[PDB]
Amino acid sequence: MYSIEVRTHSALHVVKGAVVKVLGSEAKWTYSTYVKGNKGVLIVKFDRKPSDEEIREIERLANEKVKENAPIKIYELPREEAEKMFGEDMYDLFPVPEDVRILKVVVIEDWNVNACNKEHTKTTGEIGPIKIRKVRFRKSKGLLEIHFELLELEN
Amino acid sequence: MYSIEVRTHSALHVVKGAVVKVLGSEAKWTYSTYVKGNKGVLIVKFDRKPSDEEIREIERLANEKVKENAPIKIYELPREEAEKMFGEDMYDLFPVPEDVRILKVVVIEDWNVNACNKEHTKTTGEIGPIKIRKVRFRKSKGLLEIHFELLEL
């Protein structure tokens, strides 16, 4: 039985994966993230405002991965042997400081790979249904904002 | 008489200004910077590889600002103050930590405004001629790399 913030934290990886599956490689770079209670904000680098349809497909794909109850594997490799095992993709827009040389790369098979040290749930089913509440595109910096929240319907 | 590093530091702001004059608003966000001796690397967020011509125009503009010997004014306002004086423009792609509440905004009139705490030269003339050695565009992250160096003699 995990907290709601650990839940929400894992959802970020799930939503990130769905964002990429719908929008493609152009949206694979995370700019930043934020978790507060059952609310989360994923900001990914992108160039346009997704149509309401893509947004729904993102949400549905996220929720679908939750139902699949896939395992969230947390490897803890070197840096390079993590580097050419997962590649560039495990990093965010702004890589981790060089004074770090032991990465905890969180992975969800064929979905998302990210260097993260926060606490995660063992499987995706423990996250629960995710709902996207607001999508904001910021032309200037070219950043896409995905606001979502975990739901409490018996979960 | 300033060091080479302080000179190079200042050139960054000059080059940044030139980069925006040529490429426009789309390139106003700095991703990161690096100074080593007389070499500098300005990485700005952008979506394309500038043509050889634009690169030259950047370089020429940069050097033109150096000859103008304009004053590099270093204001030091409390955080929320310098916000509506200079606006979002004084920041980089990734803003400064919230645990900072007193900014040193370096400015070059109608050229560039940036929150920086490094040491700068009083005027642009003390920077000297700037030379761009390599421009790299990274499609994936959408970042443009402007490598340059100050000249000697």
From Swiss-Prot, chain B:
Xref: Pfam families: tRNA_SAD (PF07973)
Keywords assigned:
Cytoplasm, Metal-binding, Zinc
The residues listed in the UniProt record as binding Zn(2+), with positions renumbered to this chain, are 9, 13, 116, 120
Gene Ontology annotations for the cellular component aspect, listed alphabetically: cytoplasm
GO MF, one annotated term:
aminoacyl-tRNA deacylase activity
Entries under InterPro entries matching the protein: Alanyl-tRNA_Editing_Enzymes (IPR051335), Thr/Ala-tRNA-synth_IIc_edit (IPR018163), tRNA_SAD (IPR012947)
The subcellular location is:
Cytoplasm
- Cofactor binding annotation: Binds 1 zinc ion per subunit; the homodimer seems not to bind zinc. The zinc is probably not catalytic. Another report suggests the zinc is catalytic.
Q: Which GO terms describe its biological process?
A: tRNA aminoacylation
How would you summarize the oligomeric state and partners of this protein?
A: Monomer and homodimer; the dimer is less active in tRNA editing and does not have a zinc ion associated with it. Another report shows only a monomeric form.
Function field: Functions in trans to edit the amino acid moiety from mischarged charged Ser-tRNA(Ala). Has little activity against Gly-tRNA(Ala).
* Alphabetized PANTHER family for the sequence: ALANYL-TRNA EDITING PROTEIN, ALANYL-TRNA EDITING PROTEIN AARSD1
Q: What protein family is recorded?
A: Belongs to the class-II aminoacyl-tRNA synthetase family. Editing domain AlaX-S subfamily.
The protein's name is Alanyl-tRNA editing protein AlaX-S
- Organism field: Pyrococcus horikoshii (strain ATCC 700860 / DSM 12428 / JCM 9974 / NBRC 100139 / OT-3)
- State the encoding gene: alaXS
